[PDB]
From a paper:
Many bacterial and eukaryotic viruses with double-stranded DNA genomes in the realms Duplodnaviria and Varidnaviria encode homologs of cellular RNAPs (collectively denoted “two-barrel RNAPs”). The TMP-fused virion RNAP transcribes pre-early phage genes, including a gene that encodes another, non-virion RNAP, that transcribes early and some middle phage genes. Transcription by vRNAP and nvRNAP is directed by dissimilar AT-rich and GC-rich promoters, respectively, and the two phage RNAPs have distinct overall architectures, with the TMP-fused vRNAP being unusually flat and lacking the clamp domain.
Gp64 is a non-virion RNAP (nvRNAP) that may transcribe phage genes at later stages of infection. Heterologously produced gp64 also extended the RNA component of the scaffold in a template-dependent manner. The crystal structures of gp64 nvRNAP and one of its close homologs (gp62 of phage [name]-26) were also determined at 2.7 Å and 2.4 Å resolution, respectively, and found to be essentially identical. The overall architectures of gp96 vRNAP and gp64 nvRNAP are markedly different. The gp64 nvRNAP structure resembles the structures of other two-barrel RNAPs and has a characteristic crab-claw-like architecture that includes the clamp domain. The non-virion RNAP has a crab-claw-like architecture. Gp64 is distributed along a much larger, 49 kbp region extending from the left end to the middle part of the genome (genes 1-77) and thus interacts not only with early but also with middle phage genes. The pre-early genes include the gene encoding nvRNAP gp64, which transcribes the early and some middle genes of the phage. We therefore propose that these motifs define phage promoters; gp96 vRNAP initiates transcription at the AT-rich promoters, whereas gp64 nvRNAP initiates transcription at the GC-rich promoters.
Author numbering:
A (entry chain B): 4 to 594
B (entry chain A): 3 to 594
């Protein structure tokens, strides 16, 4: 459940295709912006007569107080940054508890609290959380903070960075703290964008094929389920790099004295891992990866960070990446000499910070800017990658000027989500043909090797079929040529599982499993509901969640498979003479 | 959830309740009737398995047997019935070598089998209790087993087991496996119809009155000012109540006190985990079932706190007439007559049980037939005795003491026949064919407890409360019938106030007053769709409530919405719809 929600705010969401239709024609102009605002007004007005006061939104989502919800003493537009995020865990401290350290960016630009252990929002005594915090009384909120809270046993008193807050100087009689992201490490893989901007020569030679099964299906695989039950296997394919990095929350060395620790040498970094030794070089990375290559920089690892699951690095060292400490993830990869795929940036970053600023009139205008800028950001990003393909095909490079200009546009597009900045002069150079970037967008949507969430099992085989048609795309000759062995591997895996369908296995299971044990009326009722309405799967998800016993489900093999234990799975597969899926998949990999 | 036996690897089989009820239908206190039931039950099992497995046990419509797989008990087959059927609510394991084995039959009190250091795994309070089954085990063998109550206390340094109250062989396994079958709690302490018939003060019926009991989801509606329409039919939430309530706790022996490092207890006095009485105050002790003589209720002196939570401690000799022991029995304390209690203390103080030839049943199967058969007789004798009181009270007379004694004995043997093959005494049934007040009580207060066992469908509960209109149809004590008239009218006014106040229009109106449903997962859509189309709305809503759907997302299903909404949201919507709170209207009906 969202923050604003728990403050009683209203959440209305639109069909995402409405917003996407609006964005399709967006240009970096005033007239295009205008277009977006108009159509967004239409969506809201159609839904409830007027533009409610203090309304904010992002993409297809809109929220507003009314007077049913809590009230903010900050500009209307600013409040978007506080209401939309999920409250994953909450806690409250009396204003009287608090020590108010003074200075802007005192703990590091984005770190807002430094506290004693707090097992209510932070699992580690020496941990962190990304948070929103509110100084409130009743239904007032006078001052609010967004960013990171650090936790440590050497810290005696809750420290709060006062001047980093938003609102006005007065405080309530509480601090409510919502953790929007709980302490964790982050998967650290190379991305398509990063490989296009800073990848070593011939980086594509080091991509390989892998499988990722959700724990559900991992249990089947481990128990020796047959290939039939993984149909279509494409749903479980992923590319992988030759190694992975470290990923943790990015923190500032400015926190170290507040922990009773010493500072940190220039050019050096700490990280909560023993994978590097003091003295060794590492590649520091922070996303988005920018067209110049400046998102990846070489720094010296100098030892353990005091905070779990974190990277500590100086503002000056990571300025080119555009990083800060309000939730950014810091990734560390091995250097090229040590097997890394990202090359360190050398030289001249655009020294950006302070010039053509200006606020949005209102939450609504801010929302229109976000929606508008989001479209441009993608257009510039994709475009730059297409051009690199066109260039590489010829044997030329895209001029550095362009990469610098594209970068500045990207950075403004991100900025234009917060405030009303002037669009720089940018010539979107056309692209004639399908290029490899178009291929990459099919095969690896979003650019990340670990696929996100949602692709219907119906469409996913088509994605992995694209590897057949490499030769139809303009791009670098060695890239298209050297991808052929990986394309072949992919083809074999698909070919092995094509035509191996689950139907006969589910039918056999129904005959090999004992009669169902006696089950409550609730359960019979749901099961009846599912079958008569053709919504088995909703019913099954329910029953899985409600901890139904395996032996009560044997007349529903699909459901049974989700409740059975290791032992029961192993037994039934042996009884039916199945060859383990994995043996078949290894054979297809290695042929 | 999960029967001990199931966890021991035993097989189980429930049969339709009707197969059993049919055999019981014609049960008589004779060996021939017994053999009827046995032959019937034998058939039941054989239809399923083709044979009666070794070591089968059974109660009512449930049988278990170990088969190829189940734990092997070094105990007579018939005895295992008492260890394998009960629910396993919580479990631990102690190594044999941890235990101190105290010797002597009934050394901790008859029914108490263990005195232990605090054990949060099965007992919530450091000075609490659990009703348990304990098994001395090695691999698949169970050598010795105990049934009864465990007590824990901070003063107890080592786990103490009453070894000689164990059942089976003397060799121990290497683990003592403990299953809690009932967790520490107090128990509702209300007067019953049986208890009032047998021990009630003169005119006890005058002190019964009407009350409401809403389950928490309905109390939420009430407190927020829902309209009477949403309670339809109100009969669902009616109960009778007594003029006062007692204390109910687990019953423990004073023999535990030295083992807790405490001093003993004077004769004639009891301890309980309550401050409601002062040391010195007289109190009425009660143990169920209530027996026809009135001997289930006795006056004892309350002397102070019990060291154990949610418990009552009283002497074997003091409670003998009630037939109580300490293996899980519940002790109830009620105020004396002089202080507004409805139970009179027994003074005729003489049980004196005559000796009836008795021997062990031959097998679990024979014991099962034993309880099935005897459960029927027990029912018949107890109802019948109350009917006889109605007849006598109608004629201005009394049932003779001897009849009460004989009926009590029959009841006791009927209980005992569930354990062992005891001879039936000679008992003249002296049956009653005319409708008597006892028949009214069975309609109005099924089972005799004021707090209804709540498995009557909505469609039938109104008819139950309608029986209050029919008092003239029943022979019994003339003042009982006349004096119940005020209570009957009150019931009548409440039913009539809610009659024709149906929920439909209010549900329809909430659909039009609630905001649009905020966005919801697709599986929630699909579930709701499955419910609508299949006609299983309610199974879906039960699921969605349990999976904790937010109210926000259910506003187009008002029945579901009422189950999810907050106090604030309920109050708000009832105000906007102009409803009068059900409680104001209910109060008006009561007070008219
Ligand atoms: Mg940032
Ligand atoms: Mg007993």
């Amino acid at each position: 459940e969202r923050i604003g929600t728990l403050l009683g705010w209203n959440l209305l969401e639109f069909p995402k295709e409405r917003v996407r239709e609006l964005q399709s024609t967006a240009e970096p102009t005033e007239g295009s912006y205008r277009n977006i605002l108009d159509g967004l007004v239409n969506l809201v007005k159609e839904a409830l007569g007027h533009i409610p006061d203090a309304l904010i939104g992002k993409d297809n989502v809109v929220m507003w107080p009314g007077s049913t919800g809590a009230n903010f003493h900050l500009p209307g537009w600013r409040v978007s940054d506080f209401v939309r995020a999920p409250s994953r865990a909450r806690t409250e401290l009396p204003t009287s508890s608090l020590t108010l350290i003074r200075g802007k960016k005192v703990f590091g630009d984005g770190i807002v609290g430094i506290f004693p252990p707090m097992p209510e929002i932070v699992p580690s005594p020496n941990g962190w959380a990304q948070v929103r915090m509110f100084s409130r009384r009743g239904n007032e909120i006078f001052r609010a903070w967004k960013g990171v809270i650090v936790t440590h046993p050497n810290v005696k008193e809750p420290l709060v960075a006062f001047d980093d807050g938003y609102g006005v100087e007065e405080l309530g009689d509480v601090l409510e703290i919502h953790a929007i992201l709980l302490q964790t490490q982050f998967t650290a893989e190379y991305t398509v964008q990063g490989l296009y901007y800073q990848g070593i020569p011939g980086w594509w030679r080091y991509l390989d094929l892998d499988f990722a099964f959700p724990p559900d299906k991992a249990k089947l695989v481990e128990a020796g389920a047959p290939l039939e039950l993984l149909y279509p296997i494409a749903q479980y394919l992923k590319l992988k790099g030759p190694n992975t990095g470290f990923g943790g929350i990015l923190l500032s060395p400015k926190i170290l004295p507040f922990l009773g620790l010493h500072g940190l040498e220039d050019g050096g970094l700490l990280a909560y891992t023993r994978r590097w030794r003091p003295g060794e070089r590492v590649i520091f990375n922070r996303r988005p990866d920018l067209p110049t290559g400046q998102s990846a920089v070489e720094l010296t690892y100098l030892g353990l960070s005091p905070i779990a699951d974190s990277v500590i690095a100086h503002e000056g060292d990571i300025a080119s990446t555009g990083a800060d400490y309000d939730g950014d993830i810091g990734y560390l990869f091995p250097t090229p000499e040590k097997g890394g795929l990202y090359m360190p940036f050398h030289g001249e970053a655009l020294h950006r910070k302070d010039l053509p600023t200006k606020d949005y009139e209102s939450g609504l205008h801010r929302w229109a800017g976000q929606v508008h800028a989001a479209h441009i950001l993608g257009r510039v990003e994709v475009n730059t990658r297409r051009l690199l393909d066109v260039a590489w095909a010829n044997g030329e490079d895209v001029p550095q000027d362009y990469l610098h200009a594209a970068t500045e546009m990207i950075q403004v597009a991100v900025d234009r989500q917060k405030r009303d900045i002037q669009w720089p002069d940018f010539d979107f150079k056309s692209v004639k043909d399908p290029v490899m970037t178009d291929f990459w967008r099919l095969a690896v949507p979003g650019g990340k090797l670990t696929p996100e969430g949602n692709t219907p099992a119906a469409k996913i085989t088509n994605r992995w079929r694209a590897w057949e048609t490499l030769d139809g795309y303009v791009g670098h000759p060695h890239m298209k040529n050297d991808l052929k062995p990986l394309a072949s591997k992919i083809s074999r895996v698909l070919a092995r599982g094509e035509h191996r369908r689950p139907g006969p296995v589910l039918a056999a299971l129904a005959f090999a499993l004992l009669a169902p044990e006696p089950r409550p009326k609730e359960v019979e009722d749901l099961l009846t509901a599912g079958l008569q309405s053709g919504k088995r799967h909703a019913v099954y998800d329910a029953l899985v969640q409600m901890g139904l016993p395996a032996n009560q489900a044997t007349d529903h093999p699909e459901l049974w498979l989700r409740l059975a234990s290791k032992e029961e799975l192993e037994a039934i597969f042996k009884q039916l003479g199945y060859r383990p899926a994995m043996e078949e998949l290894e054979e297809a990999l290695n042929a």
